[PDB]
Design a protein around this ligand. Structure first.
Ligand SMILES: C[C@H]1CCN1c1nc(N2C[C@@H]3[C@@H](CC(=O)O)[C@@H]3C2)cc(C(F)(F)F)n1
Ligand SMILES: C[C@H]1CCN1c1nc(N2C[C@@H]3[C@@H](CC(=O)O)[C@@H]3C2)cc(C(F)(F)F)n1
Lengths: 301, 296
């Protein structure tokens, strides 16, 4: 159907089918065990952020790789259940639609993860070249295949060069995995999210150290954002002033999975609505905090 | 009298193939993924269809995405699903299977979705005339004994060539199931059930448990790569060595492959010795392949 010009927030990244099993004790190899509870969930960073944007009242779209099959059918039906526009999905002829398997041991809270395989090709710069950008007001890219994503980012800048300031597409990038190839992405986007895990891997012991240490790597005018779980979040823009928001932990923490993606989607949402960096930071912390007291994303708004 | 009926579980198995079994608290990447229709009776139906036998599946399912995949998979294999006991609430069983590629060992995390089992009531509604063989995977024992009593009652009223052959599998070490030993022409007892009863080999389990079967019945015990044994009314222990592949890649459903192949071979008029051997042969070929494609 018809999508009004400059109305959608696009999230480019991974969609994964997560099979989560809760067990009394971790299984011994070669054995068959009955779990306490089993759950299928749509995962992936860009994919979770789309869920959150839809629930916040934002028209949103997901761009990522899928292969036809029963995994994709479940994932597409889940995206639709969450009101996510799925028209920009890069359908593949080869590889598996990603699926992960999590075993959570109830006697100690330990999680054993069997990560998806790497058979599915990522969204390429040539796949992105074929996308009409006019329907998007904001494009969020989850860092994965960095050298291809740089070309996608250069395409958006080129688009923006011919647009008046009110038709200019806002851009955000997330550097969540501690992989060297991704650090080139710091130099792209209006808003750069760097994870606590990436920061710690670079030897930074706080969000402040992380923002001050990495601000020299962002493009002129960009805002660098770093969430540090229950220590809240920080942002640093061109004025050199470090901004901070404390976390808003729930009375009882129920489920933290996708709290970081909730934060990213909420920050993007708040910025797209014309709110200040300080306001977006606080809003991001509030919604991530509310999510932590909830199973899944139902009731975050 | 043309079909082989298998009564039991249907499970959607979400399979991950790994280089080595993960250590607790670790994160590992898998080599490959796939979905497979599983469950003991359900796997035996796949094997029977591939062996050229008309077969039917009887088991519990609930409407949903899981059942849609399983039904399409049963249909794809030409397994008759008309006897499925559709339930109003729940999810249909699913599991997470970790298959270790270095040895073919499989580890299953099963979700028995609290779906009501097939009852004696559900089974009374079944037209037995189309079946030549009825295999029952032991689960809800007191309700399955009634199903088994219904088949004996049918057989009483029939000439010997029109009599339905019956097999029972006692796979889980649950006391409740041991009453099932006294029913069927062919009784399959697992290595896991045998070990739980303190038996250290297939020969010890067959000699120790033969007093529990019906008069004339054959007791069968497969012991994985040690092969399989059978003991009938003549008191002569029969053995078949296993047929291990040079590279074991996937063992999931090898036991069910054995049961289906034994049933198939016996339904074709072959001896117990020939059936054991055939069962070991097909189970062994399966172990060197991913899934059931190419077992024949
Ligand atoms: C995003 C940051 C800014 C404030 N936010 C926050 N992140 C938390 N966690 C736990 C753990 C989750 C795992 C995940 O994202 O999958 C990390 C982030 C927990 C909390 C709490 F205070 F509300 F508890 N807040
Ligand atoms: C059925 C017996 C008689 C010969 N058969 C045989 N069972 C094996 N296994 C591994 C493990 C599987 C797991 C499962 O059934 O899901 C058990 C049985 C392995 C082999 C092998 F020699 F070919 F390797 N043969």
């Amino acid at each position: 159907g018809l999508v009004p010009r400059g109305s959608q927030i696009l999230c480019v990244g991974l969609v994964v089918l997560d099979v989560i099993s809760l067990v009394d004790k971790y299984p011994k190899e070669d054995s068959e065990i009955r779990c306490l509870s089993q759950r299928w969930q749509r995962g992936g960073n860009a994919s979770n952020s789309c869920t959150v944007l839809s629930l916040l009242g934002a028209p949103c779209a997901f761009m990522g790789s899928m292969a036809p099959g029963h995994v994709a059918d479940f994932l597409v039906a889940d995206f639709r259940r969450r009101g996510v526009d799925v028209s920009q999905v890069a359908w593949q002829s080869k590889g598996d639609t990603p699926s992960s398997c999590c075993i959570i041991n109830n006697s100690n809270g330990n999680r054993t993860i069997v990560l998806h395989d790497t058979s599915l090709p990522d969204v390429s710069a040539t796949d992105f070249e074929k996308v009409d950008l006019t329907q998007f007001k904001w494009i969020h890219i989850e860092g994965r295949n960095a050298s291809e994503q740089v070309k996608m980012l250069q395409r958006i800048d080129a688009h923006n060069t011919r647009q008046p300031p009110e038709q200019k597409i806002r851009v955000s990038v997330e550097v969540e995995k501690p992989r060297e190839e991704l650090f080139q992405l710091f130099g792209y986007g209006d808003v750069v999210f760097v994870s606590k895990d990436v920061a710690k891997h670079l030897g930074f012991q706080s969000a402040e150290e992380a923002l001050r240490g990495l601000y020299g790597r962002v493009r002129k005018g960009a805002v660098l954002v770093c969430a540090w779980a229950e220590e809240g979040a920080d942002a640093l823009g061109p004025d050199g002033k470090l901004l901070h928001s404390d976390a808003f932990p729930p009375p009882r923490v129920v489920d933290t999975l996708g709290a970081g993606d909730t934060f990213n989607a909420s920050v993007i949402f708040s910025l797209s609505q014309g709110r200040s960096v300080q306001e977006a930071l606080r809003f991001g912390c509030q919604v991530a905090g509310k999510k932590c007291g909830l199973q899944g994303f139902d009731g975050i708004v």
